[PDB]
Amino acid sequence: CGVPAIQPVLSGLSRIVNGEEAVPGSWPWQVSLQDKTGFHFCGGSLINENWVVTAAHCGVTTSDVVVAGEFDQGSSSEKIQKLKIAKVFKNSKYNSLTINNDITLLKLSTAASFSQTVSAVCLPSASDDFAAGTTCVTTGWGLTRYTPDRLQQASLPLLSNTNCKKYWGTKIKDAMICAGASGVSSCMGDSGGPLVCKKNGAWTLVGIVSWGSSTCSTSTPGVYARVTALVNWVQQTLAAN
Amino acid sequence: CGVPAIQPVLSGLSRIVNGEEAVPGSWPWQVSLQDKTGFHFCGGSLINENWVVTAAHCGVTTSDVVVAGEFDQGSSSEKIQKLKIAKVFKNSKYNSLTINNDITLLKLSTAASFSQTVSAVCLPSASDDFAAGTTCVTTGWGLTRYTPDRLQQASLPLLSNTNCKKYWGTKIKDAMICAGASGVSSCMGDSGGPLVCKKNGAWTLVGIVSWGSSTCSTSTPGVYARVTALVNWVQQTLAAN
């Protein structure tokens, strides 16, 4: 997990404004969630051939579809896998008002076929420490909500929850983590999309997009479900299902 | 339906700022949705003894609870009914990105016991016309998100979708309707709460709260699921279940 067969290329432009275009296939766990009509509404991350992790506030159902291996949503020519969802596992502690514990697991009806462009992100262990100031990466097609059709990426620093409260106040709970406010927007991340940090040669899922600045401000951080706080529930769910 | 045993009293203060406190029990279809720990996160409306209608973006589950007959959330002394949810019916056309078709039905495990303070709102027929400019009423505890613990009410005018787009642009879809921007906030409405209009002596559910001004501005209208566009699905669901 966490080692793309196609290595990402992150330049200085990933750190400013709205980030930069990714190298195609270099974020191979990145998936798109589409409704039964093909409309992209959320992102997510493959954690193995049978399971995708996303945000609970995406409200995914078994009539939605996981699309893996995508780079350009406007291209009907690249190789992609449209994967049916067998069952949706929303974290029972999710609260649609506070948006806390904002994580859902999707079990696929048939396994994805892993390849150079389709593979899994690593999950952290519950006790992993991703320190404030660590440079992490968010990817997605989130800018299409407001424009490029190709997968974007941005490098942005993790904040401590205390400093994040300076921006978002009492909205910030223990099961959240913030990143950004460093001169780059967080808006390229789709709802439910990944925030990954590279530790020991492997990209690890540290956050899941929950919400960001309503104006995509470069000085307001994004807010993410804190995966370390929720990975024990992820593993219990996989083991029971 | 739509005829409270305790008649509402709406004064001029319902039309300005943040509205006014309701007469206790005068909105008897108003329910509160609480999580399994008792935390209020959404509103909804009884449409008969076995069914509550709310917003799909509330993400209600069968471990949440419908609370009927409530006036003061801070009082443990008034008579209320905590009703378990047997099954949740989310409209399959709901889109968590556009928030269109934002309606969910909750089937209760055991019927509510209707009374002076607990009874049903009327549903419109699909062809009903609620004209722009009509004064309607939104009720709820929505101000507690930002403060009074008792049920509030505001009188505010329906907008045409064309004029609503002046405020919300391409966010406004055919299955939405807007109300407000008349000098009063829409923020007293909980997510999933009622927007009712009185036609022919009966209060009828015209809207379900979807979202409003992020600053509760008195010059920005609230956006509601348009019940006339969704009542056919409501009746199909009741008839099939």
UniProtKB/Swiss-Prot annotation, chains A, B:
EC number: 3.4.21.1
Enzyme class: hydrolase
Reactions catalysed: Preferential cleavage: Tyr-|-Xaa, Trp-|-Xaa, Phe-|-Xaa, Leu-|-Xaa
Localization (cell): Secreted, Extracellular space
Chain positions listed as propeptide in the UniProt record: 14-15
GO biological process terms on file: digestion; proteolysis
Domain Peptidase S1: 16-239
Active site positions: 57 (charge relay system), 102 (charge relay system), 191 (charge relay system)
InterPro entries: Peptidase_S1_PA, Peptidase_S1_PA_chymotrypsin, Peptidase_S1A, Trypsin_dom, TRYPSIN_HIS, TRYPSIN_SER
GO cellular component, as recorded: extracellular region; serine protease inhibitor complex
GO molecular function: serine-type endopeptidase activity; serpin family protein binding
Pfam families per UniProt: Trypsin
Disulfide bonds: 1-122, 42-58, 136-197, 164-178, 187-216
Keyword annotations: Digestion, Disulfide bond, Hydrolase, Protease, Secreted, Serine protease, Zymogen
Record bears the keyword Cytoplasm: no
UniProt key word Transmembrane helix: no
Family recorded in the similarity comment: Belongs to the peptidase S1 family.
UniProt name for this protein: Chymotrypsinogen A
Protein source organism: Bos taurus
